Design a protein around this ligand. Structure first.
Ligand SMILES: [Mg+2]
Lengths: 244, 233, 231, 240, 222, 235, 250, 218
């Protein structure tokens, strides 16, 4: 019968590893680097677009940074199509929570549920896992500013600063070196860009090859604002830090 | 939940020494309208059984189709289909009785009253009744509808108990049935003059009589009846 | 070799290896014999034990008052097929007030075994059956094989060393067929038949198993001291 | 639905998928359980290759199943969340129907049953997780400590360890733990648990987690400074 | 609107002795004011020395008996030809009846036989499965006529020892099979006189350790 | 790979045969049947000294009149016991009586072959089912994952089964008392066990008509162990 | 019987590659060249009509398809896969948008729905990926004119101008030199025809070339009058004659 | 059919455990079907249940309850609580709510952790813990005798009489109650049956010995 053609996506190796999860992580390691840095008064999300062409429409484009709700955003590393499936599910889950409790969903609860979906694909169903790693940046009234990451295994962890995708080993060393706890958003913006600038596989880091976003309490009195940076705004912040 | 539309009235029957007789008129009533006049309500199954059906005619035609299909199915992979493993009256009855009770238990009955008349392989007479409720009973005489009220009393004067069956001939039994059909024509408003009659004998087999008529009727005394009490002219 | 992974695959010579491997399970099973006259039908079965401390595996199963079988091979598969026969016999009685013909019983078993040999996932039944019975056309003996093939016979035997008993019955055909109105003599012929398949072991009181059905005899099984008469 | 039998027998009578699930447990961070005279202590390793972590929000290794029972584990982290969720639901379901909280044995038997079901169900792989379940039965002061594993077998332990280098720490506990006289106090039990982890861990900084459970739903997690005091005390006594 | 129930009349009677038990019933079957049959048996030998009758709506009655007879057959298959005790049969019948709690069998069921000590046993059921063991039970159309007579003659109710100022009751004792049949016959001839649905014939099934015996008696046919 | 319900060329189901190898790796379990009762005994086999041996539950009650001992992948037995208990209680509900030991065993064995591509694999555990009923009296059954069950006068299963079965062949007779049977289980267990037999690493149980199924205390078994050693030294 | 293929046929290899997607892209590479160019006041999409036989009527086979009145599509790769995607794309525009909001979806969202369908064929049980790359041109009130590419993986990218299929590498280079942000629609059509001539080998005329535009509203193509707000479709397929007129002044 | 029959059942907590007392009459309209009905259901040796409302509904589901209680103690190696046993039954009938079950029962037991415990369980889903409960057509008559004479420090002998006398009061006045009285005493070690008492003989006996029922000539 059909047994002959089954790859058996949800099995253990002799060493106790999940083949498909490991190979999905290998796929993600070739994706454009994405960095998240958490400050005391906000969060930064920075991501490198995958080898840009000059005729690509840059201003009306979205590849790396997606909005989940007014208080939570994600940076993507891996297959974009896979990420969008998961993103729509996460958007729906956030609204279900708001409908039920009349309160915005706590960041971890959203992360846990999305990670539990990934876990399912590794344990049952016989389907390939989602080839995606997320960096979740968000705010709630319980824990304040929070950074998480999830990967195809469905395992998630919290971070002060973290990178996913390509050159994470080199990127994590640079972040570990220059990061400190009393850091501001404006300083974190500078760290994120400097790190990408050194770890990039490109010749020089430019505005057209980047996506950028912040989550500050920079709005008027005790409320959070999401800023997805425009092309011209990235051009300005790149000059202001002295990279170009 | 149903309501019957086109209906057939009484079916009457009795046992005699060597077999059974069954009869029913050829009418399909549509309420008070006597709409259809060429309706056969006696349906033979093989050469040893006759099923007489009253009530809803659309449901009767459905049962005809089931019995016809039953004969076909019994012949499959059956070298003795025309011998030892042929369909018996008791087999045909139990099948119908199962169906009738199952349909009443689904609140969607076959709106019929059925009498299965025949002779078994060992020569024993078979006569049993079943209706829309799945109710079953057997008796030396059986009748449905008005026949139960008017025919049974006449047929029970011939065969009042089991011991009267060997004493009753086919000539006497047929005479009583034909007389009963006349009485029903006198007194049942949804009956017709034309009818069918079937005899299943253990020796002479199945005899199926069509296009019979009620005859030797008494109507002459009607001319002497005037008014409703006092009237003289 | 490459064509025996499942029942859905034909070999280049047109063989179904899984069905043949199921047939092999019957050959390993203990011997059982079936034979009939015109009035009665008899099953004789050599029961097998695990060791001296264990009981002897029951080989004969009753299906109705007028029908039953003996098994050889996987016993659980016989339980499934015998249960199916019990239901079919019972359906015939409740719906049609009719005792199920032994021939139809065979046709129903054939069709049930067949479906398991044409579909992916499932497996063939790993047991052979000898069905006896008395119906409206007299006494009957059937041989069921899990390939689906059912055969009506005067006498037969299945299991290990069944060729010896089968040869004997082929010689004795003219004699035992005319044993009418005599149960004990028909059994004796069956006990002598199964004896031709014995090696080193002999028929003891808790080893032998006999069953009979006939004209004025319901399907009944004899075990223990009740078979001491025939040793 | 996906039906494939993934967990099956091999010629030598082994179910490799279940045994490979144990290898995943062997890869996981070390977890230890020690029960005293009036308490149970759950110790857990945290690998130190991960700096720049946020310990406020990062999932804790020890999880509360109810107010009186806790669950720690070794193996795949994602798999453990599924067992913990099911256990928490069953804990509330038991309170709803029996009008009484679960016993530690019952909760363990349920979790072990879930693990077993995944070893002979079509289309699923076994959980790459072994758990240590500890607590106190309602209106009872006798300490309970149970262990489960991917196959589904479970059993009670005076003291036990699971995860990487667990055979080393089990060796330590086997000579240091006395059945006739278990740790009489909370301090003694915690110290023995920390000592056993110090045979394997590396440094006693932010690598060791300790959770103490006492009778009548009295559970508390120790902070860094509190744990560091045990580490400082043990090392000074060692130099002798 | 279609009414799935009907009333086929008739009445039944079960009495238990010391080493025997009887289950009687009239043979008349009716609908409204018509007689369907003068001899239609509704007391059946179900095997294992158990006799059974399910009186009321005959279609439901035949279905129940048919299902119980089948239950006995499968009990033998599944439990190595073990004899089904009267108490086990009773519990089984409860589950048959209660299985249709929300679309009931419109019948009053009575079974009779011998218990495991060899003593006479009668069990009676309501339409939805409540049951009870009793020495005496009448069921059906004329139950209200027969039962108070049984109370008086079998269980000696309201009868006191002569001269004892109504202080000493008449002592309970087992009746012979001959005396019980006398009470059954007199019960049915009295019911026949005063109930229109009762008559034609009387069929009694007697159960002893030896087996099941039958007796038939004529009743008035009007 | 290959199908789960596949036959070998010799005519056996691969998966059933492979599950039998798993049962050989399991701890020893012995059962002996007498006219005074049936005795069941098992090797606990703790993997480590820190493991509390009293939590090892390899002897189990099904009903008051039926007991059960297991050997092999013991986790697989839980659903078998659950089914057995339900079958026993359900029959009591339907028939107001105790259920026959054979009928109970047959119900358990019907689960055995309900696997394929139903559960994904056969059970990797064998069961010794002991009990009493009015018809056939004291009984002992051996239920395999093949769906087959044999009745036994005495039976051993597990790692030391072939050695213990040969010993039971010589020792068993039809006039054994209950006390004699208890000692005989302990004697044979001590012979095949790796570690030295005592009350903590071995467990006894029995089923009698009068008192029903009972698991023995560690205090009671300890005295029977002491009684056993004295009798062997006495000649 | 029944579909027993409930498992993924596309899986990750040790190197991290999704084989079936890569092989699907290889099939797209073999496919005939198609392109799209965005202007200030419109969008153009074009492709070569590779005829299987001269007896075949190439008019009956439409490589450029209307999805909504303001959205069009063209492809490179396997034609049958494209045809069923167009059917599904048209239906999803109604079921998941027009029947809810009473208006046609904007280009980006319809593209998103098509991408979803193609992603599912990459992960669902018992199916292979679609062997096509789409170019979807469209207009909507709030986003204006737009051009999107969709790949077998389900990934989609917005383009100022691009090409896919056989000679896409050379064609993209040609478009980089010619494209600017001040291009009028007629200039974009002219560049499209120049770019396409390089990849086409045989005959180059209105019968062998298929070309459509997303431009101004066409009241004459609406089919009715009376509702002022309804002004007609922005999608228009250029005729064989209209193409040949522009090939003279080339 | 007729499931709506009369009854008088009671159960009360006291110093020495629980007393359970019931009548024995079953009626189909005015017709007295039986005088020998068992209205106490012996769920197991430690638990009792009372029958009121549907006879079948009470019999069937309280026997079923005994099966669930046996499975509980096999799995947990511990006696089931009265709370847990009552809740299994109440949750079950709640699933059937609206279908037409008719039930009014007292689930009675005596355990270590709880002591003597009574739960009134009812077919519309009600589950009440309490000290005194009376259910049936004659419940009002029985309550009057109970309320006026009840004390926690009653002896076992006096408590048994009180339950017997309360049923008699109902049997006398309520037409659909009578026949005989069945008594039970529930202790921690199990229930004890205290016999069947014909109301006919019991009435005259109580009249003479007590001096009550002067309105009745005897
Ligand atoms: Mg009369």
């Amino acid at each position: 019968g059909s047994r002959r053609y089954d790859s058996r996506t949800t099995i253990f190796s002799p060493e106790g590893r999940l083949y498909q999860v490991e190979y999905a992580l290998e796929s993600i390691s070739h994706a454009g680097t994405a960095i998240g840095i958490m400050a005391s008064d906000g969060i930064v999300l920075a991501a490198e677009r995958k080898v840009t062409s000059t005729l690509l429409e840059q201003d009306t484009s979205t590849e790396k940074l997606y909005k989940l709700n007014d208080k939570i955003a994600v940076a993507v590393a891996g297959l974009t199509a896979d990420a969008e499936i998961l993103i729509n599910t996460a958007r729906i889950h956030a609204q279900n929570y708001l409908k039920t409790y009349n309160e915005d969903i706590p960041v971890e609860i959203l992360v846990r549920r999305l990670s539990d979906i990934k876990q399912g694909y590794t344990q049952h169903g016989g389907l390939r896992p989602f080839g995606v790693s997320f960096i979740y940046a968000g705010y709630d009234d319980r824990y304040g500013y929070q950074l998480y990451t999830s990967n195809p295994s469905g395992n998630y962890t919290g971070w002060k600063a973290i990178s996913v995708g390509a050159n994470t080993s080199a990127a994590q060393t640079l972040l570990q070196m220059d990061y400190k706890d009393d850091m501001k958003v404006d300083d974190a913006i500078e760290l994120a860009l400097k790190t990408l600038s050194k770890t990039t596989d490109s010749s020089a880091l430019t505005y057209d090859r980047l996506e950028f976003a912040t989550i500050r309490k920079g709005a008027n009195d005790g409320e959070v604002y999401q800023k997805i940076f425009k092309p011209q705004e990235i051009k300005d912040i790149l000059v202001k830090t002295g990279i170009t | 939940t149903q309501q019957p539309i086109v209906t057939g009235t009484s079916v009457i029957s009795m046992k005699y020494d060597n077999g059974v007789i069954i009869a029913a008129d050829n009418l399909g009533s549509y309420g008070s309208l006597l709409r259809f006049n060429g309706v056969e309500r006696l349906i033979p199954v093989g050469d040893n059984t006759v099923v007489g059906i009253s009530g809803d005619i659309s449901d009767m035609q459905h049962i005809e189709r089931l019995l016809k299909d039953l004969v076909t199915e019994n012949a499959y992979d059956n070298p003795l289909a025309d011998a030892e493993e042929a369909l018996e009256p008791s087999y045909i009855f139990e099948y119908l009785a199962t169906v009738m009770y199952q349909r009443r238990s689904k609140m969607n009955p076959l709106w019929n009253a059925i009498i299965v008349a025949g002779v078994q392989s060992n020569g024993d007479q078979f006569l049993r009744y079943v209706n829309l409720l799945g109710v079953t009973y057997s008796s030396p005489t059986l009748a449905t509808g008005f026949g139960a009220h008017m025919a049974n009393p006449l047929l029970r004067k011939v065969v009042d108990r089991e011991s009267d069956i060997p004493k009753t001939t086919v000539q006497v039994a047929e005479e009583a049935i034909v007389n009963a059909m006349r009485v029903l024509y006198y007194r049942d408003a949804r009956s017709s003059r034309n009818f069918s009659l079937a005899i299943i004998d253990k020796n002479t087999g199945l005899t199926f009589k069509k296009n019979l008529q009620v005859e030797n009727m008494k109507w002459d005394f009607a001319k002497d009846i005037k008014g409703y009490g006092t009237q003289k002219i | 070799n490459n064509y025996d992974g499942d029942t859905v695959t034909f070999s280049p010579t047109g063989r179904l290896f899984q069905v043949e491997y199921a047939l092999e399970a019957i050959k390993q099973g203990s011997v059982t014999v079936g034979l009939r006259s015109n009035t009665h039908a008899v099953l004789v079965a050599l029961k097998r034990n695990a060791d001296e401390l264990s009981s002897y595996q029951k080989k004969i199963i009753k299906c109705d008052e007028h029908m039953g079988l003996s098994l050889a091979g996987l016993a659980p598969d016989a339980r499934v097929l015998s249960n199916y026969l019990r239901q079919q016999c019972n359906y015939s009685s409740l719906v049609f007030n009719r005792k199920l013909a032994v021939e139809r019983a065979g046709h129903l078993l054939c069709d049930k075994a067949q479906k398991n040999t044409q579909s992916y996932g499932g497996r063939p039944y790993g047991v052979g059956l000898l069905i006896i019975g008395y119906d409206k056309s007299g006494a009957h003996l059937l041989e069921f094989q899990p390939s689906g093939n059912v055969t009506e016979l005067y006498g037969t035997a299945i299991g290990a060393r069944s060729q010896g008993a089968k040869t004997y019955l082929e010689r004795t055909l003219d004699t035992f067929i005319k044993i009418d109105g005599n149960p004990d003599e028909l059994i004796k012929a069956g006990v002598e038949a199964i004896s031709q398949s014995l090696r080193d072991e002999s028929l003891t009181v808790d080893n032998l198993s006999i069953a009979i059905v006939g004209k004025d005899t319901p399907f009944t099984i004899y075990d223990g001291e009740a078979v001491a008469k025939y040793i | 639905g996906y039906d494939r039998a993934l967990s099956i027998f091999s010629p030598d009578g082994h179910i490799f998928q279940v045994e490979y699930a144990l290898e995943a447990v062997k890869r996981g961070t070390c977890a230890v359980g020690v029960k005293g005279k009036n308490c149970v202590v759950l110790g857990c390793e945290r690998r130190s290759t991960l700096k720049l972590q946020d310990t406020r929000i990062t999932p804790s290794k020890v999880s509360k199943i109810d107010s009186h029972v806790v669950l720690s584990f070794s193996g795949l982290n994602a798999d453990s969340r599924i067992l913990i969720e099911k256990a928490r639901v069953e804990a509330q379901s038991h309170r709803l129907t029996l009008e009484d909280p679960v016993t530690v044995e019952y909760l363990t038997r349920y979790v072990a049953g879930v693990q077993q079901r995944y070893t002979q169900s079509g289309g699923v792989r076994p959980f790459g997780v072994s758990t240590l379940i500890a607590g106190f039965d309602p209106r009872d002061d006798e300490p309970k400590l149970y262990q489960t594993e991917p196959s589904g077998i479970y059993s009670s332990w005076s003291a036990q360890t699971i995860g990487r280098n667990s055979k080393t720490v089990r060796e330590f506990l086997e000579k240091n733990y006395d059945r006739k006289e278990p740790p009489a106090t909370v301090e003694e039990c915690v110290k023995l648990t920390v000592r056993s982890l110090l045979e394997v861990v590396q440094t006693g900084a932010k690598n060791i987690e300790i959770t103490v459970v006492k009778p009548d739903s009295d559970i508390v997690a120790l902070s860094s400074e509190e744990i560091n005091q045990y580490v400082t005390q043990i090392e000074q006594e060692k130099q002798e | 609107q279609f009414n799935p129930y009907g009333d086929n009349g008739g009445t039944i009677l079960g009495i238990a002795g010391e080493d025997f038990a009887v289950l009687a019933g009239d043979t008349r079957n009716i609908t409204d004011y018509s007689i369907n049959s003068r001899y239609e048996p509704k007391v059946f030998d179900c095997g294992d020395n158990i006799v059974m009758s399910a009186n009321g709506f005959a279609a439901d009655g035949d279905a129940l008996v048919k299902r119980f007879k089948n239950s006995v057959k499968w009990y033998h298959f599944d439990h190595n030809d073990k004899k089904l005790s009267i108490n086990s049969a009773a519990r089984n019948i409860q589950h048959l009846l209660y299985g249709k709690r929300f679309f009931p069998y419109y019948v009053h069921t009575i079974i009779a036989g011998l218990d495991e000590d060899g003593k006479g046993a009668v069990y009676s059921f309501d339409p939805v499965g409540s049951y009870e063991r009793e020495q005496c039970r009448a069921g059906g159309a004329a139950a209200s006529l027969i039962m108070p007579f049984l109370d008086n003659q079998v269980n000696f109710k309201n009868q006191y020892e002569p001269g004892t100022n109504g202080k000493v009751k008449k002592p309970l004792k087992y009746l012979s099979v001959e005396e019980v049949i006398k009470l059954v016959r007199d019960s049915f001839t009295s019911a026949t006189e005063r109930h229109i649905q009762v008559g034609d014939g009387l069929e009694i099934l007697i159960v002893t350790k030896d087996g099941v015996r039958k007796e038939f008696y004529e009743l008035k046919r009007d | 790979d290959r199908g789960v319900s596949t036959f070998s060329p010799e005519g056996r189901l691969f998966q059933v045969e492979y599950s039998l190898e798993a049962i050989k790796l399991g701890s020893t379990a012995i059962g002996i049947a007498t006219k005074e009762g049936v005795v069941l005994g098992v090797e606990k086999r703790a993997t480590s000294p820190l493991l509390e041996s009293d939590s090892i539950e390899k002897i189990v009650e099904i009903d008051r009149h039926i007991g059960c001992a297991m050997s092999g992948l013991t986790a697989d037995a839980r659903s078998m016991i659950e089914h057995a208990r339900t079958a026993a209680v359900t029959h009591n509900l339907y028939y107001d009586e105790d259920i026959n030991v054979e009928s109970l065993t047959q119900s358990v064995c019907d689960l055995a072959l309900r696997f394929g591509e139903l559960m994904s694999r056969p059970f990797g555990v064998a069961l010794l089912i002991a009990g009493h009923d009015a018809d056939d009296g004291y009984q002992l059954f051996h239920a395999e994952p093949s769906g087959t069950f044999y009745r036994y006068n005495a039976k051993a299963i597990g790692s030391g089964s072939e050695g213990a079965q040969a010993e039971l062949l010589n020792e068993w007779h039809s006039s054994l008392t209950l006390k004699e049977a208890e000692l005989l289980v302990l004697k044979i267990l001590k012979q095949v066990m790796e570690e030295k037999l005592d009350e903590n690493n071995a467990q006894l149980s029995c089923i009698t008509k009068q008192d029903g199924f009972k698991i023995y205390d560690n205090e009671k078994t300890a005295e029977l162990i002491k009684e056993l050693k004295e009798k062997e030294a006495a000649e | 019987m029944t579909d027993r293929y409930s498992f993924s046929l596309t899986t990750f290899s040790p190197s991290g590659k999704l084989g079936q997607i890569d092989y699907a892209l290889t099939a797209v590479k073999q496919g005939v060249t198609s392109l799209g160019i965005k202007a200030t006041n419109g969008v153009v999409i074009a492709t070569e009509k590779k005829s299987s036989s001269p007896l075949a009527m190439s008019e009956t086979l439409s490589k450029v398809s209307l999805l909504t009145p303001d959205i069009g599509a063209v492809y490179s790769g396997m034609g049958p896969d494209y045809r069923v995607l167009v059917d599904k794309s048209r239906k999803v525009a109604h079921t998941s948008y027009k029947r809810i909001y009473g208006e046609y979806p904007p280009t980006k969202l319809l593209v998103s729905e098509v991408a979803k369908i193609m992603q599912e064929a990459t992960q669902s049980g018992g199916v292979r990926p679609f062997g096509v790359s789409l170019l979807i041109a469209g207009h909507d009130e709030f986003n204006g004119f737009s051009l999107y590419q969709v790949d077998p993986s389900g990934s989609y990218f917005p383009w100022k101008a691009t090409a896919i299929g056989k000679g896409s590498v050379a064609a993209k280079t040609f478009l980089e030199k010619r494209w600017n942000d001040e291009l009028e629609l007629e200039d974009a059509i002219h560049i499209a025809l120049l770019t396409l001539k390089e990849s086409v080998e045989g005959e180059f005329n209105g019968d062998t070339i298929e070309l459509a535009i997303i431009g101004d509203e066409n009241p004459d193509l609406l089919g009715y009058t009376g509702i002022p707000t309804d002004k007609g479709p922005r999608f228009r397929k250029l005729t064989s004659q209209e193409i040949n007129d522009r090939l003279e002044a080339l | 059919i007729k499931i709506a029959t009369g009854a008088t059942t009671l159960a009360f907590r006291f110093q020495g455990g629980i007393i359970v007392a019931v009548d024995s009459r079953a009626t189909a309209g005015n017709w007295v079907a039986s005088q020998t009905v068992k209205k106490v259901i012996e769920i197991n040796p430690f638990l009792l249940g009372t029958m009121a409302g549907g006879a079948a509904d009470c019999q069937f589901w309280e026997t079923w309850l005994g099966s669930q209680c046996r499975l509980h103690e096999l799995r947990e190696k511990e006696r089931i609580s009265v709370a847990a046993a009552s809740k299994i039954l109440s949750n079950l009938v709640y699933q059937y709510k609206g279908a037409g079950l008719s039930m009014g029962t007292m689930i009675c037991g005596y355990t270590r952790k709880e002591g003597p415990t009574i739960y009134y369980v009812d077919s519309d889903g009600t589950r009440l813990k309490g000290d005194i409960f009376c259910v049936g057509s004659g419940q009002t008559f029985a309550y009057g005798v109970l309320d006026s004479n009840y004390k926690w420090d009653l002896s076992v002998e006096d408590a048994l009489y009180l339950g017997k006398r309360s049923i008699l009061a109902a049997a006398h006045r309520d037409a659909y109650s009578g026949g005989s009285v069945n008594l039970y005493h529930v202790t921690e070690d199990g229930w004890i049956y205290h016999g069947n008492h014909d109301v006919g003989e019991l009435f005259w006996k109580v009249k003479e010995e007590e001096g009550s029922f002067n309105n009745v000539i005897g």
